[PDB]
């Protein structure tokens, strides 16, 4: 390289053997992405069939206990462990895999290896984009999934008491974590969360409208009703009538796109902005900084017994959520709340 002799060495041989066409691309990033992702998926799929949560959360979270797919989960370590990484060699387990499983240490193991797998996947995208030389907007858009992953699996437990409040790897466990933010954090009323949900539903808008519009303003290219074969992989001409699309959306919606490039980039822009703002919101939640109470509305509700609103209904439902959460979701608090102190309405 650089018109100098460049005698081939171990690095050169490794690069030449690594960046080449295969069924699965290895490259340099495969030194981390393949083992880390393999370990993460293996640990999770092992946890949803084997790992009992009876000693971590005191629950059932695998098929070995009779759970189904949703209720099966790789469960978080106990809050008494704090923010320990729970090494199998470390003081928690000290080389004993069998009781390292009962400690919930594979939660931290799989979360760590999955973070490194996300890093390796982004590095694989970057390495492929370097190998065959086009812009890495896939990695630019992929910057948001890793932001979500960090902000909800590491930032939130590190801000809170420990990994126990972190989400567990499993669909019903994610549902538990979601209702946990609904009750404790009022995550629906969080501004950054509304930023994110607006961005994601707008991403669904752009994806659906772009696919439908492209498939509905197509040129002829036909003499056959199956328009899929109307496209040729090697052609330098448009396949769908964009000017017709612009007129249709200008007369239907009032505004329309005048550029394919800006259209596609805004399609990229909406979900990455939504996920990044959601990540910032859960980062704000990580230190018990919520959009929970509207001060003026709660004041006027306090000095007005008739002033009922949907916001106050949500607030009251959230302390009801938390009052029912504490006892059966926080064993390490051993909150033996009696039946009478539980808030409830008439009848039911």
């Amino acid at each position: 390289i650089g018109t100098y002799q460049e005698k081939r060495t171990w690095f050169d041989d490794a690069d030449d053997w690594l960046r080449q066409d295969r069924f699965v691309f290895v490259g340099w990033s495969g030194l981390l992405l393949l083992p880390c992702a393999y370990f993460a998926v293996g640990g999770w799929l092992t946890g949803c069939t084997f790992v009992t949560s009876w000693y971590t959360h005191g629950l059932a979270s695998s098929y070995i206990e009779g759970c189904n797919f949703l209720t099966a989960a790789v469960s978080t370590p106990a809050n008494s462990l704090g923010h320990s990484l729970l090494f199998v060699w470390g003081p928690e387990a000290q080389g004993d895999l069998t009781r390292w499983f009962q400690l919930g240490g594979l939660w931290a193991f799989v979360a760590l290896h999955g973070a490194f797998g996300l890093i390796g996947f982004m590095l694989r995208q970057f390495e492929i984009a370097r190998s065959v030389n086009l812009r890495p907007y896939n990695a630019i858009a992929f910057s948001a999934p890793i932001a979500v992953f960090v902000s909800v699996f590491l930032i939130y437990p590190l801000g809170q008491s420990g990994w126990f409040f972190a989400p567990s790897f499993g669909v019903a466990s994610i549902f538990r974590f979601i209702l946990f933010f609904q009750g404790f954090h009022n995550w629906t009323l969080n501004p950054f969360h509304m930023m994110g949900v607006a961005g994601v539903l707008g991403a669904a808008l752009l994806c659906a409208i772009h696919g439908a519009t492209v498939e509905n303003t197509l040129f002829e290219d036909g003499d056959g009703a199956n328009t899929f074969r109307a496209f040729n992989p090697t052609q330098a001409e448009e396949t769908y009538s964009m000017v017709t699309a612009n007129r249709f959306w200008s007369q239907i919606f009032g505004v329309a796109f005048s550029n394919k490039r800006w259209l596609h980039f805004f399609m990229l822009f909406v979900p990455v902005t939504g996920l990044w703002m959601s990540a910032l919101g859960v980062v704000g939640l990580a230190l018990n900084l919520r959009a929970y109470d509207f001060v003026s509305q709660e004041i006027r509700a306090a000095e007005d017994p008739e002033f009922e609103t949907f916001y106050t209904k949500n607030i009251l439902l959230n302390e009801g959520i938390r009052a029912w959460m504490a006892a059966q979701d926080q064993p390490h608090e051993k909150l033996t709340l009696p039946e009478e102190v539980l808030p409830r309405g008439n009848a039911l």
Partner: peptide
């Protein structure tokens, strides 16, 4: 003195070096 945690740290680090050597061997064994 030398703690069991430090002993486990040393074992983990030499194990990581062994893993790196195994990665190098597996990638050079075509």
């Amino acid at each position: 003195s030398v703690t069991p945690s430090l002993k486990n740290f040393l074992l983990s680090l030499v194990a990581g070096a062994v893993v790196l050597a195994a990665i190098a061997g597996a990638v050079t064994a075509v």
